[PDB]
Amino acid sequence: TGDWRTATSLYEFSAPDIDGNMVDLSKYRGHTVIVTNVASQCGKTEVNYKQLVELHERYAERGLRILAFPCNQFGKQEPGSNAEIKEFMARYNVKFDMFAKIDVNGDSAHPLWKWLREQPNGKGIGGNAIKWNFTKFLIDKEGKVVKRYGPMDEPKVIEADLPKYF
């Protein structure tokens, strides 16, 4: 219906990429997806970027796609413009998909993230708030959330779940 409250998969949403081009996320139909909120000035920025890059290098050939959403809501650790953030990810040689900066919590949260927070059967009242930088969601080939991993779970925690969804 266009309402995030009614959506049942990743494929109902669209978001601008880091260059500002609108991306319809149905482009990921049939792929294994990780969605994560990122930041450049977090204690865990280096380990998350390094391990996300490693997962993409190991598993892109199996259809793994990583969608990274910058977000400045957690300690103001993503203060850069989109153009600044684009320059930053190359230091990690990021070749997965980078999106324009968004809010993930609160009144201005992007609708995809309003939906992600509700995933285990939320009633539309806010769900499980994103707690800090580098939360991750593993999404299956039908666009359904299958697991959430927190700021403290390094990306390599997702690895043993990946072959179930390739």
The encoded tokens of residue 69 equal 């959403």
Looking at residue 95, its amino acid is K
Locate 95 and state its tokens: 């070749």
Q: Which residues of 26-59 are buried (b: 16+ CB within 10 A; e: fewer)?
A: eebeebbbbbbbbbbebebbeebbebbbebbeeb
Q: 99: which DSSP letter?
A: B
Resolution (A): 1.3
Residue 97 phi, psi (nearest 5) = -95, 125
Residues near 127 by Cβ (< 8 Å), separated by ≥ 6? Answer: 114, 116, 117, 118, 119
Per the entry, the structure determination technique was: X-ray
As beta bridge partners, residue 129 has: none
Which domains are delineated in the chain? 10-164 (3.40.30.10)
d(Cα 32, Cα 3) in Å, to the nearest integer?
24
